[PDB]
Design a binder for these strands. Structure first.
Length: 49
RNA sequence: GACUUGGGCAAUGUGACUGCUGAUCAGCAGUCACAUUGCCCAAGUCUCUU
């Protein structure tokens, strides 16, 4: 209820309802693919389960 | 003991694709008969001609 912009709400909860692992993961995403060519980027995410 | 991956054996189905039969419909072709009025040649009968 501090902010009502659903974009800002989603970003805030993704930033603060999440472990530092996911925070750093998404930060690597944003610093890697901020505004690059969508055709240029082609990446894999490997997880356990 | 969780976690992950892969494979195999099952059954219960679905989605379609062709093959055959029948029916329906659209789509083309080859004809044939035959009234009507015309045209050009062949041979006939007759007026006239003679």
């Amino acid at each position: 209820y501090d902010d009502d912009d659903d974009n800002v709400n989603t970003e805030e909860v993704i930033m603060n309802f999440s472990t530092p692992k996911v925070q750093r993961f998404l930060m690597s995403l944003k610093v890697s693919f901020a505004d690059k060519d969508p055709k240029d980027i082609c990446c894999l995410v490997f997880v356990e389960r």
